[PDB]
Design a protein around this ligand. Structure first.
Ligand SMILES: CC(=O)N[C@@H]1[C@@H](O[C@@H]2O[C@@H](C)[C@@H](O)[C@@H](O)[C@@H]2O)[C@H](O[C@@H]2O[C@H](CO)[C@H](O)[C@H](O)[C@H]2O)[C@@H](CO)O[C@@H]1O
Ligand SMILES: [Ca+2]
Ligand SMILES: [Ca+2]
Ligand SMILES: [Ca+2]
Ligand SMILES: [Ca+2]
Length: 168
C-alpha cells in the first residue's frame, strides 16, 4: 500500500560540526513533507499547513475543543510570517478571532495550547495598551491589527490549524 511505503521513508529517517548535519536533515525532511499539500474542503493552505476560519462564534474553551474535533488545534503561531498572514485574514474579514494563547494557568504568563511559551519577539503583536487584563482577561484574540486579551467566556470566531496531508 502507499501509506505503507510512506512509513518506510519516515522509518529510515528516524534511523538517521554536527549541528550542520541536523540542519541539512531538517531541509531534507521538509523537502519531502512539501509534497503533502491536501487540505480539507473550505480550509486554507499556507506554508504546508491548513487553516480553518470558522463561520460561527464560541468561547475560548469551546473553540479549543472545536478544533480537536477536526484533528486540529486552536492556532498556535510559530513565526512572524504566519502571524502577519492570519492578522491580515482576520483584519480583512472584520472578525475578532481566538488563537491558542492564554495566561489562564498563571496570570501574566502567556502560553500556547501546545505548551510553548510566548517568545519576547512576539510581544510586539499586542495592541497598544495590551494585555491589560481588564476585568480578568486570560485569552488572546486577533483584534484590529494586533492582539488583545479578552474574557474566556466571550464569544469569537476562531481559527484552527493542522498539517497538510499526503492523502485525501
Ligand atoms: C473593563 C471593560 O470591559 N472595559 C470596556 C472596554 O474593553 C476593555 O478595554 C479594551 C481596550 C480591551 O482591553 C478589552 O479587552 C477590555 O475589556 C471597551 O473597549 C473596547 O473593547 C473591545 C474588546 O471587548 C475592543 O478592544 C475595542 O477596540 C474597545 O474599544 C469599552 C467600549 O466598548 O467599554 C469598556 O470600557
Ligand atoms: Ca540544504
Ligand atoms: Ca487571570
Ligand atoms: Ca490575564
Ligand atoms: Ca484587553
Amino acid at each position: 500500500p502507499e501509506k505503507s511505503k510512506l512509513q518506510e521513508i519516515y522509518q529510515e529517517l528516524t534511523q538517521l560540526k554536527q549541528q550542520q548535519i541536523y540542519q541539512e536533515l531538517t531541509d531534507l525532511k521538509t523537502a519531502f513533507e512539501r509534497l503533502c499539500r491536501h487540505c480539507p474542503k473550505d480550509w486554507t493552505f499556507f506554508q504546508g499547513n491548513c487553516y480553518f476560519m470558522s463561520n460561527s462564534q464560541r468561547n475560548w474553551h469551546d473553540s479549543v475543543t472545536a478544533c480537536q474535533e477536526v484533528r486540529a488545534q486552536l492556532v498556535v503561531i510559530k513565526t512572524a510570517e504566519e502571524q502577519n498572514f492570519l492578522q491580515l485574514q482576520t483584519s480583512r474579514s472584520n472578525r475578532f478571532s481566538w488563537m491558542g494563547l492564554s495566561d489562564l494557568n498563571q496570570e501574566g504568563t502567556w502560553q500556547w495550547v501546545d505548551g510553548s511559551p510566548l517568545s519576547p519577539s512576539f510581544q510586539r503583536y499586542w495592541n497598544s495598551g495590551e494585555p491589560n487584563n481588564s476585568g480578568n482577561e486570560d485569552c488572546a484574540e486577533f483584534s484590529g491589527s494586533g492582539w488583545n486579551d479578552n474574557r474566556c467566556d466571550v464569544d469569537n470566531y476562531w481559527i484552527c490549524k493542522k498539517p497538510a496531508a499526503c492523502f485525501r
